[PDB]
Ligand binder design. Sequence first.
Ligand code: LUR
Ligand code: LUR
Lengths: 116, 115, 116, 115
Amino acid sequence: CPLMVKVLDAVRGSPAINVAVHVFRKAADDTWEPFASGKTSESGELHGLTTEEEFVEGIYKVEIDTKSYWKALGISPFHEHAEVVFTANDSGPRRYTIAALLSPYSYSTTAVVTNP
Amino acid sequence: CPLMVKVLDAVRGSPAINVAVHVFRKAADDTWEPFASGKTSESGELHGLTTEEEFVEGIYKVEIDTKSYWKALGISPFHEHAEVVFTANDSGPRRYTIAALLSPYSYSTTAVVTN
Amino acid sequence: CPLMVKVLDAVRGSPAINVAVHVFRKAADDTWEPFASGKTSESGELHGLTTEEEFVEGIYKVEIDTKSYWKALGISPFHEHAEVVFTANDSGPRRYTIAALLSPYSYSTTAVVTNP
Amino acid sequence: CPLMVKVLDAVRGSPAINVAVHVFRKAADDTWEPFASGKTSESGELHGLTTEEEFVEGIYKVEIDTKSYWKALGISPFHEHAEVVFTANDSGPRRYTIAALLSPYSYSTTAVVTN
Ligand SMILES: Cc1ccc(Nc2c(F)cccc2Cl)c(CC(=O)O)c1
Ligand SMILES: Cc1ccc(Nc2c(F)cccc2Cl)c(CC(=O)O)c1
C-alpha cells in the first residue's frame, strides 16, 4: 500500500487502536476533498487507505482523530487532532508511512517515505 | 501573552528563526478565520500573537510554515507545514506555549499550558 | 522476538539503516553486562537481538550508535548515542519494540510494549 | 549559564517540575564522573548547573530521573531515566539547552545550541 498510517500511544506504550484517520486531498480549487479514511487496527496500523492508482500526486492531509482517542481513555488532550499535510508523489510514486506518536499534550508525526 | 509559539530546528539544534506562523480561529461555519501571525524571532519564539482579551475559548489552528523554513536551508521537507489544532480551554488562568520541534521528515508539537 | 529496535532517520524520512545497537543488562553488582548487539536492517529494524529465554527480568540499556550513523552521512550530530534504559519483564514477559526517531540534534525513543 | 536542562511533561502539558537531573563528565577511564545536578524548577528548567570555566569540552551525560517523576504522578513509566549523552564542542561561543519532552513510554530530547 502506498499510504500507511501508524499511531502509537506514548502514555501506554501501545499501538493506538481504533483511532480514526481521515485523508483529504487538495482539489484544484484549494478545497480539501475527502480522499480516504479508516481506523487503526489492533497493531495501531491503518493499511489499505488507498491504492497506487488512486494515490496520485497532490497535497494530502491526514487528520488523525487523536482527541476521540484520548477522550475514550478519559484524558482531555490538548490537540483536536494530529495532522499531516504533505505533497505526495512529486518525483514519482512513493510508499508513505505516517507514524504519529501521541501524548495528551504532544504528538509527533513522522514520515517514512520509501521508493517502491 | 496568552499564546506563544516556539519553533526549534532539530537538524541544526537551533531556534528555527523567521518561521512564519499563522493562527486561525475556527469560525461558526467550520472555516478557519485568520486571527494572528508572525515570524519566529532569533530565539525561535513568536510572542505577542494575541492578548488575553482576544484569546477567547475556541478552536485554534496554528500553522507553522515548516516547508519554507526547510527550503531556506536547502533541505527537502516532508510536510507542507506543521498544523497545531487545539481548543483554548480557558478554565484559567492559562498561558499556552506551543513548541514545535522540526525535522525535515518529522515534527513534534507540544503544548506547555501553565498558570 | 521479545526485543526489537527500530530506528528512523527524521531528516531523510527513511529507516536508519546499519545503525549499531548495543544492549546491556544491569548485573547484580550494578555494572552493565553486554547483553546483545546488532545492526538495523534495510527496514531500520533490528530483530533477533535476544530470545524469550535469554531476555529475563532486569534493567536493560539499549545504546543506539546514532553518532556513527549521522557521521557516515556527513552530519555532526549532538548526541553520542540514543539510549533507552528500562526495566524489562517486571510483571512477566513482554514484547518490546524500541523506536528511535533520529535528528542530528534531537531524538525520541518510544517503547511499544505488548503482551505476547 | 552554558548548560540548561528543560523538562516538559507531554501528558499534562506542563513543565516537569522537581525532576532530578544529574550531569556527568566522561572520565579518562571511560567512567562517568558526577559533575552537576539539580531539580527542575517550577518552569521545568534547571539553571546554574555549571559555569563557562567548568564546562570544558568533553563527553557529558545528562541523566534525567524521569522514572521518579512519573511515579510521583502515579503513571507507570517505561524508562528508568532519560539519558542525554553528548560532546560539548566548544567551537564557540556555545549555550546548550537540553529539552526533554517526557511521556510515560516515550521521550524526546533536543539540544538547542546557540551563540
Ligand atoms: C517504516 C516504519 C517506521 C517507523 C515505525 N515505527 C515508529 C516510528 F517511526 C515512530 C514512532 C513509533 C514507531 Cl513504532 C514503524 C513501525 C515499527 O516500529 O514496527 C515502521
Ligand atoms: C531555547 C529553547 C528551546 C526549546 C524550548 N522549549 C521546548 C519546549 F517548551 C517543549 C519541548 C521542546 C522544547 Cl525545545 C525552550 C523553552 C520555551 O520557550 O518553551 C527554549
